[PDB]
Each structure stands twice: as C-alpha cells, then as structure tokens.
C-alpha cells in the first residue's frame, strides 16, 4: 500500500485509468480533425485550429488525471491509445457532430466516474470532478451544439459559402 | 401630505406608478428575447446581448420613474411585472417585431403620460420625460425599425445565411 | 430533446425556472425596500443603497439560473414576479427583519433544489448550487442578522438616534 | 425697442425682474442662516458652510437672471433686497424648515413665472426654467425635507446630543 493512500478504492483508482485513456483518444480524435482541416481540398483553417486547440486541452485533461493518481497514490496504468474512428470527416457539420457525440461520450464517462466516487464515499475525488472537470465539459458541449445549429442555419452540408462564412465569422 | 410636495397632482402620481410597471414589463420582455437567443437550438449570440443589454435599459428607466417619484413626494406603489407576451420569439425578424411594437408602446405610454402633465400643469413632469425619455425613445425606435430593414433585406425569415449575417455584422 | 441535453431531469429543469422566479422576486422586493428608504419622510440614504445594491445582486443571480437553463439543454419559462408584500417597510429594523425571513426562503428553496439535484444524481446542478449559491446565501444571512443584532442594541424602532447612526456608521 | 428683442412680453420681463429680487433675498436669508450658526452660542460649523454655499448658489442664479434678460433685450430694474424674516433662527430644526418653506416660495415664483411664458407663448423662457431652475429646486427641497425629517428623529429641538450628531454626519 502507498504511504499516502487514504479512502482511495482500488476500483477509482482503476475508472481513473480508464478516463485518462479516454481522455487522450478525445485529444486523438481531435488531432485528427485538425489534420483533415488543414489539407488543400478542405482548408478551413480556423476550424483547423479550434480543433488543434482542443486536441491540446484534451491532452491536458489527461495529465491532470495522471497527477491526480499519483496524488491519492495510486499508480497510472497506460493502454493504447486507439486511432479515431473516422479517417477523414467529411465538412465542418459533419464534424462537429462527431465532436458532439465525443464530448457526450467523455461527459458520461465522467459522470460514472462520480457516481463511483459517491457509492465509494470518496468526497475529494468528487470535488475533484465537479471542480475540474464536469463544468468545462458542460461548456464545451454547449459551445460544440450552438455551432451545430449555426452551421444547419447556414445550409451545411450543402452550401459552401456558408461553410466559408463559418470558418470566417465563427471561429 | 409629504413636506416635499408642490404641484404634483394625485393622476400624475399614479400615472407614474402605473409607467415604472410598463418599463419594467419592458424590462422583463428582454429578458426573455435574451434567453432565447442564448437557446443551444437558437445560438445567436450577438443579438442575445444585444437583448440583454435592452433589459437593463429598461430596468434604469424603471429605478428612475421611483427615484422621480421620491423627489416629488409621491409614493412608489408596486405591481406585479406580468411574464412577457411570448414564450419563445421565433427567429431575429420575430423578435425584433415585436421589440418594435414593445418601444412604441412605451412611447405611447410616455406621450401620455405627458399630455396628462400638460393638463395639470406640471412642466417638471414635461422636462424629466422630455429630457429623460421621449428622445432615448425615438432613437431605439428608429435603431429597431432599421435592424428590420435590413433582416427583411437579409431574406428573413427563410434565410438562414441572411440571419447568421446579421448576428456578425450588424450586433 | 435538445442536442446538448445530458444527466438533466425534467423535474430539475422545473425547479430551475421555479428558483429564478424566486429570485426575481427577491429583487423585486429589495427594489421596494430601496424605495422606501429614499422616501422624503424616511430618509436613509445608506439603507436605501444597501437595499438598490442587494436588489441588483438578486437580478443577477436570476440571470445565472437563465444562463446555467440554456447551458443544460432546459428551457427558460418565465412566470409573473409577484408584488412584494408590503407596500412600506416601517423601519430599518423591520426591514432587515423582512430581508433576513427573505433570504431564509430562498436559502431553503436552494436547499430544496440541491435535495432534488441529489435525488436525481445530478452532480454538475449540485455543483453549481454549492460554488455559486449556497455560501453566498449563508454570507447575506450572517450580514443581516449582525445587522438585526446591532438595530436591537442601538434601540430601534423607538430610539431614533440609534437608527440615525445605524445609517451613518454600518451601511 | 431693443434691436434683439423677440417673442418677448413685456409681462414676462417684469416678471423676469422680479424673480431675480426673490432670488437675492434667498440668498440674503441663507446668509442670514450662515452667520447665526458661526456664532459662539450657536457653534455649528458644518451647518453654518451649508447655508453659507446655499446663499452662494442663490447669487448665482439672480446673475443668471440678469444675463438672461439682457439676452432677450429686456431691462434689468433692481429693487431693494429686502431683510430676512428673522434676525435669529433658533436651532438648526427650525432653520431648516424655513429654508423648506423658502425654497418651496421660491419654486412657486418659478412656476408661476414659466405659467406667464406659457401663456405668452414664449417657449425659450420655459425652456429656460426648466432646464436651469426647476429641476434645481426639486432637489433642493428633496434634500431639506430630507433633513427636517433625520433632524425630527434625532429629537430635535430639545436633543441636543441629536443636533450635534447631524452637523458631525450628515452636512
Ligand atoms: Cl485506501
Ligand atoms: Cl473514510
Ligand atoms: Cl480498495
Ligand atoms: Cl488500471
Ligand atoms: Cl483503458
Ligand atoms: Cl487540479
Ligand atoms: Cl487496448
Ligand atoms: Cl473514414
Ligand atoms: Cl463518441
Ligand atoms: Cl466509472
Ligand atoms: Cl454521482
Ligand atoms: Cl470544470
Ligand atoms: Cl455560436
Ligand atoms: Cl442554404
Ligand atoms: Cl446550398
Ligand atoms: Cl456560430
Ligand atoms: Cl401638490
Ligand atoms: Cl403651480
Ligand atoms: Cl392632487
Ligand atoms: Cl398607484
Ligand atoms: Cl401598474
Ligand atoms: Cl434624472
Ligand atoms: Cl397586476
Ligand atoms: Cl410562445
Ligand atoms: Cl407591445
Ligand atoms: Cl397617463
Ligand atoms: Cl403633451
Ligand atoms: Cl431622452
Ligand atoms: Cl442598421
Ligand atoms: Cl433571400
Ligand atoms: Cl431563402
Ligand atoms: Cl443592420
Ligand atoms: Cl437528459
Ligand atoms: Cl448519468
Ligand atoms: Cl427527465
Ligand atoms: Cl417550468
Ligand atoms: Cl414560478
Ligand atoms: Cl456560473
Ligand atoms: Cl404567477
Ligand atoms: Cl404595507
Ligand atoms: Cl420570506
Ligand atoms: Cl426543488
Ligand atoms: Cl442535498
Ligand atoms: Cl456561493
Ligand atoms: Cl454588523
Ligand atoms: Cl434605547
Ligand atoms: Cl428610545
Ligand atoms: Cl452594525
Ligand atoms: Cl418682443
Ligand atoms: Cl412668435
Ligand atoms: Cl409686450
Ligand atoms: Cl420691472
Ligand atoms: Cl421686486
Ligand atoms: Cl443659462
Ligand atoms: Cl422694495
Ligand atoms: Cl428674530
Ligand atoms: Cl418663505
Ligand atoms: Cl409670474
Ligand atoms: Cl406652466
Ligand atoms: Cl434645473
Ligand atoms: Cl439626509
Ligand atoms: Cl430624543
Ligand atoms: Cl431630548
Ligand atoms: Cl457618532
Ligand atoms: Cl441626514
Ligand atoms: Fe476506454
Ligand atoms: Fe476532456
Ligand atoms: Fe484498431
Ligand atoms: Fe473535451
Ligand atoms: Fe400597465
Ligand atoms: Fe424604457
Ligand atoms: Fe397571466
Ligand atoms: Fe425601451
Ligand atoms: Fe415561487
Ligand atoms: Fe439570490
Ligand atoms: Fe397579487
Ligand atoms: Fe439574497
Ligand atoms: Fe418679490
Ligand atoms: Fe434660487
Ligand atoms: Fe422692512
Ligand atoms: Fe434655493
Ligand atoms: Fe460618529
Ligand atoms: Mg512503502
Ligand atoms: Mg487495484
Ligand atoms: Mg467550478
Ligand atoms: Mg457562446
Ligand atoms: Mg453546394
Ligand atoms: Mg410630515
Ligand atoms: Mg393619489
Ligand atoms: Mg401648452
Ligand atoms: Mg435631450
Ligand atoms: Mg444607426
Ligand atoms: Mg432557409
Ligand atoms: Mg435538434
Ligand atoms: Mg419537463
Ligand atoms: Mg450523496
Ligand atoms: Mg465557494
Ligand atoms: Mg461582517
Ligand atoms: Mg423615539
Ligand atoms: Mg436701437
Ligand atoms: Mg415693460
Ligand atoms: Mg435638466
Ligand atoms: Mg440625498
Ligand atoms: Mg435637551
């Protein structure tokens, strides 16, 4: 047993593994946008970059998780990180609704991971969630949905110009 | 009869209650024009400030009528603020229709409430709204009747590209 | 449903809107208490501005439940503000008093929220209750009845100059 | 006739003639207030400087009067300035209900005076009082009733710990 281990479950200690890993597909996937926002016969570059930053913030969120585990002291278990689901993601609708559903997904994940923490009576683990994690994911999912909206508003897929005002005006 | 008072007829008085009321149902017909804007199926950002910002106007010209109200010796008497007209407003031309319809009767409100000062005599009365209200009247009607020059002009309300513009350029 | 929606029970949403009318109703009845105070035969300008301030306060608690509605995937529905009631508050102790029962009912309606909240394992609603609610609350309540208690040793209602420098020297 | 004279009565440049005396006999009469509350047996500094700038303002709009008539081409006539109705004003209580009672003489002159512009169709000399005298008085007496009623609470005339008191905190 590590020396600072206290009210630390080894079942949390597990599910933190497992979101951290979750956390870096999240930054994966969004690497991969970025990279097909960038190509010449898509070259949207704002969109690109929206998705670069949040590639960084999700690489972010796992090394907090890494820290966190060695702060209770559990010990950080890595997986692989698998490639994302798609190789191309078709427009900017296409993709943000795929961010969407990634954002809901990494939410969930999260919220099974407080849910362990209360059935675990684990309070500093919930603060944890509550106060670094569940709100920036609120956030983001809002932020991902007002876009969606946006670029429905704006004929995606089929209009070009409004996918070229997007990129312009949005981002 | 308060220490303070000189020719300020009991009408006056209560047509003064009776408008910091309208100005707060103003108020609070913003406040929803807001929210629904800030709506994830909505998400027009610009003009929901731009609504937000017009219910605090409204809620200053409220605080003034009781602050007029004490300095002339009458009694602030509240009622309720009624909910406004609509739950949700339907797009930017919608709202801005009824934002129109809403600052006209306002001024109406206001215009009467003049003629009933100039028919007791009170030009204190005449100069506070005169100089307080009937031209900030004037020039929010005029910004509004413009702002839906130009949403018709933009296609509203078939044409969502039009109404995204309008969100980046004119708010 | 809308697209962001996630972990957010009807029932929640309901009291959401429920517990920003409150809100807007404590506003409301602050503004009546400012009103009071600024009145010629009443004359505490420092009470009076405690009061404008705290009513200003609760608007913007009120706007953060319309924010936080729409972050969720809930929707704003607004009811009347109901009048407050009473139309004259007395005295500076009476009106504190008021405010203390005030912020007691709204201090439990918040409570009640966080109880629902719990019930329907709602962990982000909960957080948001305890970072940006419930101190604020017991802070005001504390603020008021060391108020209370210093208005009772100073003598009101009858003693005139203590109330006098109640004004003067804690507000 | 004067060269620049237009639109101008003759009844209104009496009048005009007239409420400048009235304005130099407030201004006498504060004086008046001001020198009683320097004296020995009296010792109210703070009250004294407030009538003291009181009958400064009061010169001051008797020149504006003057200025005003000369750039209609009316005629300054001057009369006596006539004493205050009192040699000694008792406590500041009582001085300060007969500056009420003057101010609110003085705003009846005003109002009668823009009620002469009105009939004579002379909207620059309503104008005129409007925009630079009665918006003035309303304050002006807001504040001294103000006053006589934290004077009445304080326990004024027989407290004269109360009377300290308000010179310390309140002027
Ligand atoms: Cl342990
Ligand atoms: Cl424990
Ligand atoms: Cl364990
Ligand atoms: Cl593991
Ligand atoms: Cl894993
Ligand atoms: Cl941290
Ligand atoms: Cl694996
Ligand atoms: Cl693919
Ligand atoms: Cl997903
Ligand atoms: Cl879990
Ligand atoms: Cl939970
Ligand atoms: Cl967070
Ligand atoms: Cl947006
Ligand atoms: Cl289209
Ligand atoms: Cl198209
Ligand atoms: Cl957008
Ligand atoms: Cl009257
Ligand atoms: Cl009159
Ligand atoms: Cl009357
Ligand atoms: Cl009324
Ligand atoms: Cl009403
Ligand atoms: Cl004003
Ligand atoms: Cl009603
Ligand atoms: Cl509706
Ligand atoms: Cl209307
Ligand atoms: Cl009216
Ligand atoms: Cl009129
Ligand atoms: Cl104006
Ligand atoms: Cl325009
Ligand atoms: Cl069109
Ligand atoms: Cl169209
Ligand atoms: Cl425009
Ligand atoms: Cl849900
Ligand atoms: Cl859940
Ligand atoms: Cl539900
Ligand atoms: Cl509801
Ligand atoms: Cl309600
Ligand atoms: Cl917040
Ligand atoms: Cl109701
Ligand atoms: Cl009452
Ligand atoms: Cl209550
Ligand atoms: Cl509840
Ligand atoms: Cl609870
Ligand atoms: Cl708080
Ligand atoms: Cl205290
Ligand atoms: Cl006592
Ligand atoms: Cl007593
Ligand atoms: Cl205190
Ligand atoms: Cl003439
Ligand atoms: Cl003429
Ligand atoms: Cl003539
Ligand atoms: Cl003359
Ligand atoms: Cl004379
Ligand atoms: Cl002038
Ligand atoms: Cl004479
Ligand atoms: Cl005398
Ligand atoms: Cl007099
Ligand atoms: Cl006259
Ligand atoms: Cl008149
Ligand atoms: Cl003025
Ligand atoms: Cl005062
Ligand atoms: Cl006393
Ligand atoms: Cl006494
Ligand atoms: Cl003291
Ligand atoms: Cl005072
Ligand atoms: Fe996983
Ligand atoms: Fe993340
Ligand atoms: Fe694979
Ligand atoms: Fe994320
Ligand atoms: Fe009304
Ligand atoms: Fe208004
Ligand atoms: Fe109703
Ligand atoms: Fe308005
Ligand atoms: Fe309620
Ligand atoms: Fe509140
Ligand atoms: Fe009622
Ligand atoms: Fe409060
Ligand atoms: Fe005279
Ligand atoms: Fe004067
Ligand atoms: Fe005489
Ligand atoms: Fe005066
Ligand atoms: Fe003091
Ligand atoms: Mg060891
Ligand atoms: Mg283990
Ligand atoms: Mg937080
Ligand atoms: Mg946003
Ligand atoms: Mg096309
Ligand atoms: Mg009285
Ligand atoms: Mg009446
Ligand atoms: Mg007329
Ligand atoms: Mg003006
Ligand atoms: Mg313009
Ligand atoms: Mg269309
Ligand atoms: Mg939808
Ligand atoms: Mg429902
Ligand atoms: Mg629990
Ligand atoms: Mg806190
Ligand atoms: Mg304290
Ligand atoms: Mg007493
Ligand atoms: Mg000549
Ligand atoms: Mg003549
Ligand atoms: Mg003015
Ligand atoms: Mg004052
Ligand atoms: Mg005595």
Request: charged residues 30%; negative net charge; proline residues 2%.
């Amino acid at each position: 047993v590590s020396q600072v281990r206290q009210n630390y479950h080894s079942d949390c200690e597990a599910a933190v593994n497992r979101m951290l890993n979750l956390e870096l597909y999240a930054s994966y996937t969004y690497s991969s946008m970025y990279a097909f926002f960038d190509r010449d016969d898509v070259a949207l570059h704002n969109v690109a970059e929206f998705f670069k930053e949040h590639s960084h913030a999700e690489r972010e969120h796992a090394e907090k998780f890494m820290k966190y585990q060695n702060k209770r002291g559990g010990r950080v278990v890595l997986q692989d990180i698998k490639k994302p689901e798609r190789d191309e993601w078709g427009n900017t609708l296409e993709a943000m609704q795929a961010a969407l559903q990634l954002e809901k997904t990494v939410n969930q994940a999260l919220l099974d991971l407080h849910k362990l923490a209360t059935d675990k009576v684990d309070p500093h683990l919930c603060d944890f969630l509550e106060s670094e994690y569940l709100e920036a994911q609120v956030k983001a999912i809002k932020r991902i949905g007002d876009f969606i909206t946006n670029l429905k508003r704006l004929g995606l897929p089929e209009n070009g110009m409004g996918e070229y005002l997007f990129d312009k005006h949005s981002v």
